[PDB]
């Protein structure tokens, strides 16, 4: 990585910079270190918990 | 209790002849499913009673097209469109609509000329 | 699956027992419906019993409910029966047969379907 | 003004599912028991299931290969691409199927409320449709509370709520 | 006049389904992290070993240009620039 | 005498689905045609499908690796862990989805019986709900057999079964 | 003249879903709005999704291994067999589930038409069942067009379409 | 997908034919709706026909139902047409165009949607 | 049969002017879907007739915001909020509600001052 | 998940603030319901607030709505609170507690369930 | 507002004795879910208030079978079938049916003989 080092803290990092590994998947980079989510090629993985947002 | 009796027949047939045999039951072979569970099997000496007909009107994958059948209720028949050298032995009826299956019965013996 | 293989026996004396078994070739033995049928010399075929090996208990033919044990081993892919309190009634041949659809038994009045595979062997003599 | 037949309500902030009412003693929106611990709980378990199903990647970071290890590089690459396509496929498919199932779940749940209310009101309802239940009697706040809980003991209402019977 | 429905929202978050491509929903969970901070951080409070211009061979062999790394005894991860300049000094095969 | 609306019956033994009855000539439980070769057959095919889908593991038992083959060991391990997580995921997901679908299948099947009977009895039913169908005429064993088979030719019953019409 | 309850129509050709009619002014079959851009569009997206989901195989063609590379051969084989069983499983499962969902989708869509029409005709329908809607008034071609579009403004018909009310 | 590429021709004599084709770049050719449109010099645009390549048969413009063959090759990702019994009517340019949604055709009265991609080329001269 | 005719206009416009063109149809462009399938295309000499408007009121991704439109039934218009140097050529109407699509028609030619 | 760990503080003067935090062990921190409870010496327990870390905003105890900030970091798996405008009211111990079902909050009248895990630590002294 | 008050008791108990404590609420603990959200916790000096009872009638996984409970509406009790050496400290009631949870209250102090 060419990322600079700074005064920050993370559980998982990729070559492009540190990420917060709270979500099950990431699409930042295939190579990761630490307590990491699974890399996917998907652009978006948004799950519905709610209702269709269509007013009457 | 599950009885479909074979009519014995003193009927040698020649090759090229047509032939049929039939059974009479004490109760209907029609199941609440709407299907009739009639099967026909042929046993030759030393052999297992191989399945020929798997539905009243449907011949199985193990037998030539010369074999078929028909019937309803308690009245059923096996039809052979042409008796060939392969046809010799005892035919049995079977009902699969009850826990005790049909006794296969005495069987109908087909002889050649 | 496409084949059922079964072995016979030497003379069994009255008061003893006869053990009969068949091995099924192929896969999914566990959901096969295996039944036993017998034939005395000169006689027709009659039911001994019916098993769906990993699904439930056997259903025995009424004349044999106090006489036989019919069981199966889903590991060995083998169906077995033991005929107890032998009275040396005409025996001769027992047969292992596999039904067609072999629907899972929960309900015994469910149709017993067709016997697609019917093996040969098991010639047993009695005193 | 309408219900789920046409869309949702922006006046209801307390409920994924609920009721809207107008009566002689009031007007407003409220959530009920099919949201609280039902749609909410079903979804919570689903959300946690999706999260719980993934295995934290305490695995190889990556590997380097030599000039004469091209088959090994390609095997590793095939393994990574294979697993990546499989997991992209599974991740997206899980989300698409779960999203379709979730939205179907939610449509089912609002319909279940509709069937619940219809079961108590059809006996004395004037019109059922467009998400609304009309009555053959006038309602107060007590009528609305009973319908929402499922305590609309219609025989105590249907005797007065009979205008269409009176007119035929 | 009792109506049955579901709430609507001011949400602009959309999802895809097998039948639909862009469905706005009232609530959602982002299961995918698509961002980073552009920086190297500590892992659970522990600093990385940043080699920078120094390759792993440089680090472990002790390429003198990266002698400063000789003072780093522990780390959370190892970081090498994508195109290291200070690796093996005196070239050869590193078995 | 509540049905599927509240739960199942412990008095029905050869049943996955069936009826419970009380009438002038009898009382008891029995299974019908929606179990035999329908729910039973659907499930049999599903059970066999799940079993048939797995490939018997006539594969590598395991492999040893050298001290200088750590990348190969890790590749093999990654492959085993990858396939293990994929198959654990698929096996558990298949079971969870199939179990949800199976239970939904079964709820659908009992509801289908309810809709079948409602289609013949609503024309002369006194009350429909809680899994029970009440009549506006008294039943004998013949009434029950016709409803169970789906031969309740209501026009032959609805003429006598009209107490609510007589009273309005 | 039975509908989806018994099966489909061979007399309808521009359809996936539609109506069959007989009236004082005509006879024939026609497709409607639940096929065009609805069942058709849902299916189009599904078909394209299944196709789009596969990654064109610009991957390794195959590899050869040496006599002393049996573990590498077996690792490669395990990887190919693993991925092959996973993709055969996923491909067949996707097709089986999508086929069951597609057929269920289609059954749902024809039922949705049935519910649509029932919602407008039950108020003045003589009989509903076997896929057919009977009326308590005689129809012309205008009646049929309104029902098909969903403009059967029943209050303009139900006043004349009341033979069962006249007879009770 | 984002681009349609098509070639022209030398002088074609009456009694002969004109062959026109276009290749589509990108993926899912098989479900693309490809139509042909023509324009004589000084004139507007008119329809030749419409194909959904792996889904079904073509639908030809009425003035051309007894004159043209419009086909496709899902392998080559190419749409083709041959104009038969040439009468050397003003020809000039033919165009390959791809619709937007490209919904699967089973029903021809399904909307033909928008032409998002419209190629250029196919200048054909006739005697 | 599927005809939406362009009104020819002897209307050169200067840059900075507003402009609009319109078409008149023999039958409605409103499909049973509820959508109106009107499209506008602009052809410059040597060019394909590039899509500008993909719905009666919706400009496509390939054109600047200066282009929009409106209409209903058989009466439709293309509106240009400001004529710029990029605007020169022949505009066509298109109906996609029928198997034979709309003949694009003669087209409306826009000239500059 | 099974354990919540929290630290205390030195004397905090009035007009300043107190910072309290807890780290949760294990996984799925993001959907845990973490609440804060306090106890003055000789007194019982009372609510400070409630967070579902990646789902939504906090809900603060009424006596503290104009006094505290309760937040969380889903990355650090840590819940935090800062008590502002300290008046040196009896302080002593604050506690981090995790509820049982921890249902996703969208509705605040959803039951707060049971506290299965209740940590210890955070002894804070004030002037 | 969410108050379920502990009855203070001047009740030292010996080991082997049975014991119980109770609380009285200003409002019902029965939630619209149909469940009663009553919990009991025991705090020893220096310890967190560990959960003993998680439902009115259900003892949790962290406590021996000697602890159980009962109640309805606003009236609740904790029952100890046998007081053992492990039982010493202050018991609190908790209501989880409202956003502000129950104040745990003063707590009931159990002393030994
Ligand atoms: C809890 C946490 O650390 N969140 C950070 C967020 O502040 C930052 O903006 C983002 C992208 O750099 O990464 C994540
Ligand atoms: C959803 O809409 C956005 C614009 O807000 C667009 O970029 C995206 O491609 C759309 N998604 C799909 C699947 O078409
Ligand atoms: C890397 O080398 C460049 C010169 O190419 C120099 O400017 C830079 O400071 C060096 N970085 C480190 C970390 O030594």
> Of the candidates F138, G7, F125, A49, which has an alpha carbon nearest to the alpha carbon of residue E25?
A49
What one-character DSSP code corresponds to residue G97? H
Q: Are strands G18-23 and F132-135 parallel, antiparallel or unpaired?
A: unpaired
Which stretches of F10-140 are DSSP H helices?
40-52, 70-121
Backbone angles phi, psi at C104, to 5 degrees: -65, 130
Residue J52 forms contact with K (CB below 8 Å): no
Which stretches of A1-56 are DSSP H helices?
none
Give dist(CA C88, CA C125) in Å, integer: 9
How many C-beta neighbours within 10 Å does residue F108 have? 12
> 45-84 in G: which are within 8 Å (CB) of E?
45-46, 49
Q: Could you tell me how many residues make up chain F?
A: 168
DSSP letter string, I29-92: -B-TTS-B-EEEEEE-TTS--EEEEEETTEE-TTS-TTEEEEEETTEEEEEESS--TT--EEEE
Residues 6+ positions from F157 with CB-CB distance below 8 Å:
F124, F135, F137, F143
Residue J104 forms contact with D (CB below 8 Å): yes
Element (H, E) at G45: helix G40-52
Sign of the C-alpha dihedral computed for residues F83, F89, F95 and F97 taken in this order = negative
Give dist(CA J75, CA J53) in Å, integer: 10
Q: Is G3:G12 a contact under the CB 8 Å cutoff? A: no
Give dist(CA K52, CA C32) in Å, integer: 52
Backbone angles phi, psi at D166, to 5 degrees: -65, -35
Which of the listed residues J23, J75, J76 should we mutate to test ligand 1's pocket, taking the one with most ligand atoms within 8 A of CB? J75
Give dist(CA A6, CA A29) in Å, integer: 20
Helices D70-121 and D40-52, axial angle in degrees (round to 10): 170
Q: Is I1:I101 a contact under the CB 8 Å cutoff? A: no
Residue D61 forms contact with G (CB below 8 Å): no
Q: Whose CA is nearest to atom 8 of ligand 1?
A: E37
Give dist(CA D71, CA G63) in Å, integer: 7
Residue H95 forms contact with I (CB below 8 Å): yes
CA of residue D29 relative to chain centroid, distance: 17
For ligand 3, is residue E62 a contact (CB within 6 Å)?
no
Q: Whose CA is nearest to atom 4 of ligand 1?
A: A20
Q: Is K107:K88 a contact under the CB 8 Å cutoff? A: no
Q: Where are the strands (E) in D24-107, listed by range? A: 26-31
Q: Which chains touch I (3 or more CB pairs under 8 A)?
A: G, H
**Residue-wise burial string across F23-48, b where 16 or more C-beta atoms lie within 10 A, e elsewhere:** eeeeeeeebbbbbbbbbbbebbeebb
Whole-Å CA distances, D130 to B48, D20, G113, H66 = 68, 13, 17, 52
**Beta bridge partner(s), residue A14:** A17
Q: Are strands I4-6 and I19-25 parallel, antiparallel or unpaired?
A: antiparallel
K99 contacts on D by Cβ (under 8 Å): none
What one-character DSSP code corresponds to residue F38? I
**Beta bridge partner(s), residue K76:** K23, K71
* Burial degree of G159 (CB within 10 A; 0-12, 13-18, 19+): exposed
Torsion angle of C-alpha atoms D151, D156, D157, D163, degrees rounded to 10:
150
Give dist(CA J63, CA F67) in Å, integer: 65
| Cβ–Cβ below 8 Å for J120 and K31 | no
Residues with CB under 6 A from ligand 2: E 16, 21-22
Q: Which chains touch H (3 or more CB pairs under 8 A)?
A: G, I
Nearest Cα of chain I lies from the Cα of G33 at a distance, in angstroms, of 7
Q: Report how far ligand 3's centroid is from the alpha carbon of I6 (Å).
A: 68
Element (H, E) at D91: helix D70-121
Give, rounded to a whole angstrom, the gap between the first and last alpha carbons of chain E: 83
For ligand 3, is residue E48 a contact (CB within 6 Å)?
no
Residues 6+ positions from E42 with CB-CB distance below 8 Å:
A8, A9, A10, E48, E76
Give dist(CA K22, CA G59) in Å, integer: 72
Nearest neighbour of D40 by CB, restricted to J27, J30, J106: J106
Q: Whose CA is nearest to atom 2 of ligand 3?
A: E53
Whole-Å CA distances, G138 to D102, D158, G132 = 44, 34, 15
Q: Whose CA is nearest to atom 10 of ligand 3?
A: E53
For ligand 3, is residue E52 a contact (CB within 6 Å)?
yes
* Burial degree of C67 (CB within 10 A; 0-12, 13-18, 19+): middle
Q: Whose CA is nearest to atom 13 of ligand 3?
A: E52
Give dist(CA K2, CA E79) in Å, integer: 55
Nearest neighbour of D51 by CB, restricted to J28, J106, J111: J28
Q: Looking only at Cα atoms, what is the longest distance across chain A?
A: 52
What one-character DSSP code corresponds to residue D130? T
Nearest neighbour of D78 by CB, restricted to G72, G79, G90: G79
Residues 6+ positions from D51 with CB-CB distance below 8 Å:
A24, E31, J28, J30, J31
Q: Is J115:J1 a contact under the CB 8 Å cutoff? A: no
H111 contacts on I by Cβ (under 8 Å): 31, 33, 35, 37, 96-97
Give dist(CA B92, CA B75) in Å, integer: 14
Q: Is I106:I5 a contact under the CB 8 Å cutoff? A: yes
Q: Report how far ligand 2's centroid is from the alpha carbon of G16 (Å).
A: 30
Helices F70-121 and G70-121, axial angle in degrees (round to 10): 20
What is the resolution of the experimental data for this entry, in Å?
Answer: 3.1
Whole-Å CA distances, H81 to A14, F52, H68, H71, K87 = 53, 48, 7, 6, 93
Sign of the C-alpha dihedral computed for residues F107, F109, F112 and F113 taken in this order = negative
């Amino acid at each position: 990585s060419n990322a600079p080092m700074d005064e920050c803290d993370a559980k998982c990092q990729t070559p492009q910079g540190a990420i917060n590994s709270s979500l099950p998947f990431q699409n930042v980079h295939p190579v990761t270190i630490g307590e990491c989510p699974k890399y996917v090629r998907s652009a978006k993985l948004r799950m519905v918990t709610g209702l269709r947002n269509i007013p009457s | 209790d599950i009885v479909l009796t074979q009519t014995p027949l003193s009927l040698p047939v020649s090759l090229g002849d047509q032939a049929s045999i039939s059974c009479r039951s004490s109760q209907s072979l029609v199941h609440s499913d709407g299907n009739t569970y009639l099967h026909w099997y042929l046993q030759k000496p030393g052999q297992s009673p191989k399945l020929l007909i798997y539905k009243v009107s449907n011949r199985f994958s193990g037998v030539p097209d010369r074999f078929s059948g028909s019937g309803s209720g308690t009245d059923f028949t096996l039809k052979i469109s042409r008796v060939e050298a392969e046809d010799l032995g005892v035919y049995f009826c079977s009902q699969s609509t009850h826990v005790p299956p049909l006794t296969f019965g005495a069987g109908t013996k087909l002889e050649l000329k | 699956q496409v084949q059922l293989v079964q072995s016979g026996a030497e003379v069994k004396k009255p008061g003893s027992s006869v053990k009969v078994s068949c091995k099924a070739s192929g896969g999914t033995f566990r959901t096969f419906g295996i039944s036993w049928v017998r034939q005395a010399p000169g006689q027709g075929l009659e039911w001994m019993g019916w098993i769906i090996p990993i699904i439930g208990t056997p259903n025995y033919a009424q004349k044999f409910q106090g006489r036989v044990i019919i069981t199966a081993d889903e590991s060995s892919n083998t169906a077995y029966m033991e005929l107890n309190s032998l009275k040396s009634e005409d025996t001769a041949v027992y047969y292992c047969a596999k039904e067609g659809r072999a629907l899972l038994r929960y309900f015994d009045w469910l149709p017993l379907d067709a016997f697609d595979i019917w093996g040969q062997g098991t010639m047993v003599t009695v005193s | 003004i309408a219900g789920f037949i046409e869309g949702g309500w922006t006046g209801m902030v307390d409920g994924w599912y609920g009721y809207h009412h107008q009566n002689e003693q009031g007007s407003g929106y409220a959530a009920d028991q099919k949201s609280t611990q039902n749609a909410i709980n079903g979804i919570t378990n689903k959300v946690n299931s999706v999260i719980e199903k993934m295995n934290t990647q305490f695995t190889a970071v990556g590997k380097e290969f030599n000039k004469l290890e091209r088959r090994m590089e390609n095997l590793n690459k095939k393994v990574d691409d294979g697993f990546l396509d499989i997991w992209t496929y599974n991740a997206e498919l899980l989300v698409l199927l779960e999203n379709e199932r979730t939205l179907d779940f939610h449509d089912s749940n609002v319909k279940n409320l509709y069937e619940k209310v219809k079961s108590q009101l059809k006996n004395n309802a004037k019109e059922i449709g467009n998400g609304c239940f009309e009555f053959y009697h006038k309602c107060n706040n007590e009528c609305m509370e009973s319908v929402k809980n499922g305590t609309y003991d219609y025989p105590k209402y249907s005797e007065e709520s009979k205008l269409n019977r009176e007119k035929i | 006049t009792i109506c049955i429905g579901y709430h609507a929202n001011n949400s602009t978050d959309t999802v895809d389904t097998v039948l639909e491509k862009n469905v706005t929903v009232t609530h959602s969970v982002n299961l995918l992290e698509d961002s980073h901070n552009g920086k190297l951080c500590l892992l659970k409070g522990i600093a990385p070993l940043q080699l920078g211009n120094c390759s792993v061979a440089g680090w472990i062999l002790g390429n003198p240009e990266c002698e400063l790394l000789i003072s780093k005894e522990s780390w959370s991860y190892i970081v090498e620039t994508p195109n290291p300049e200070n690796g093996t000094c005196y070239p050869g095969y590193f078995a």
